Amino acid sequence: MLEQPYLDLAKKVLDEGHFKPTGTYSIFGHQMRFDLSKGFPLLTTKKVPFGLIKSELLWFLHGDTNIRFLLQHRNHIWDEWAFEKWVKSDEYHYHEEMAKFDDRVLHDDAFAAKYGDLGLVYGSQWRAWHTSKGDTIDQLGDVIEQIKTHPYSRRLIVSAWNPEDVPTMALPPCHTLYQFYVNDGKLSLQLYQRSADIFLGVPFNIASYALLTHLVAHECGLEVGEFIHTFGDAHLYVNHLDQIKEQLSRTPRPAPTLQLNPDKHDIFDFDMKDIKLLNYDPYPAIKAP
């Protein structure tokens, strides 16, 4: 099954992973491949929230780094490092005061501008990379225009890694770099992910980059190829061992098939209703830690 590469990697970190200081069990250099013409790679062995994947992709793809967009969509994925940026502030005076942040940010323009904005997160690196001259570059923009024009280039690349920012910045991007490849009709993407939580993050990571490859294949009139997911250090926390173990006890079902609106073509102007997941039938979600 399509999601078998995920289960193999969790199995392998479990058996031959290495310990390091709660600490981890990790492995360096693993790859997973997913033929996206055989379905969509949302895990069935565990329920994965696709509208959270969906919204946090479109957020990046607008070049947006403000939390408001994500909260206007009932997605609370990125809120922590925003909340984090209002408490270490000049202004500041959990579970409920975090509901505070969200109506204030949600409704107050001069508040959403200070504390909504995470700054150096993916929407900027993808769509507004800051240059020496203080201009800004849309690399993903440039790249897609390149796919259409020069589908065979070996330069179809998007980096989220800024050697100037990464010493200073809050969270150095785990989704370090990606590359496109075209070949007789079909668009493949490969991702270099420098660091991966196999239990919590990886199941989302795959869905975002599979969705990203479909969306981009859509805009350029192409059918979809492989999504290849390459790791530096893929690791298990030592307090997610039974959860993943239990998840290993389950038996994948047919993969869902994704559906994209057949005459909207620029993914930068996409909203929810434009992407549909068909026949997703998962085993239940697992709480942790």
Add this chain to the structure above:
Amino acid sequence: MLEQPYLDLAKKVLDEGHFKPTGTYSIFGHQMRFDLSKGFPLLTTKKVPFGLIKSELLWFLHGDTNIRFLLQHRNHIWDEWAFEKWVKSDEYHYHEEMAKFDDRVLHDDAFAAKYGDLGLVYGSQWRAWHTSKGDTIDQLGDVIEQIKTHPYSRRLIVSAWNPEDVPTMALPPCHTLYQFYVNDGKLSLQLYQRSADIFLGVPFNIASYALLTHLVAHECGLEVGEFIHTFGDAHLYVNHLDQIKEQLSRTPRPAPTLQLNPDKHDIFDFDMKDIKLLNYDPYPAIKAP
């Protein structure tokens, strides 16, 4: 054998590679692994010039981007794009006029400064990344100091990819990014190489990054682990088919073992005599195209 991953990948592009416009046969997403504790990965099925590997590594590791250093070492690897930068010039008035470039550059300080210097090549990206403020960053410096200090970080990364330069620059780096990993005693490196000529470039690429992993393992008091070599688009030119084919007809021998001076410890101040290759016994070199 240790060099078997190389031969498998050349075999695989030959059998299931894809054609694209002389044009290529290529494959997207392949990985090669090399346990560097079982020897050094210089190819025996073809002779690979290790002192050229050796000098063009130390050149990068000085932060140097001038051709002179490489010519004072009888290495002529990077000269073309230098020569290229003197003919499209304001000054300009092959096989012999390229011997011209080399004594002039070799002996004339005000000439070696205009035309020696390739500018945006690896020595700068590794040791002097240019910042928004016009300062400069030694990322490899920073990284090595990190390995010693925080051997378990998942942030041990060096990028050669500058979204600001890559649209303008002469040659967007093929050796896009690399990452280190430590684990009970041993240093591993993984390389993301976005584009690879399997016949001409790849056999060097492996030796440079294996050598780089040994040198860095040396400075940080560590024993060596895996070198994992990850490809975007690894390709064969359609006019190197018989050469590689013929190379497939040969039978690897024990791998050489490398030797590094046992009380010099900073690789940034290294020169030749500090690295020795022991018991390298290759089949002959193959001309091409």
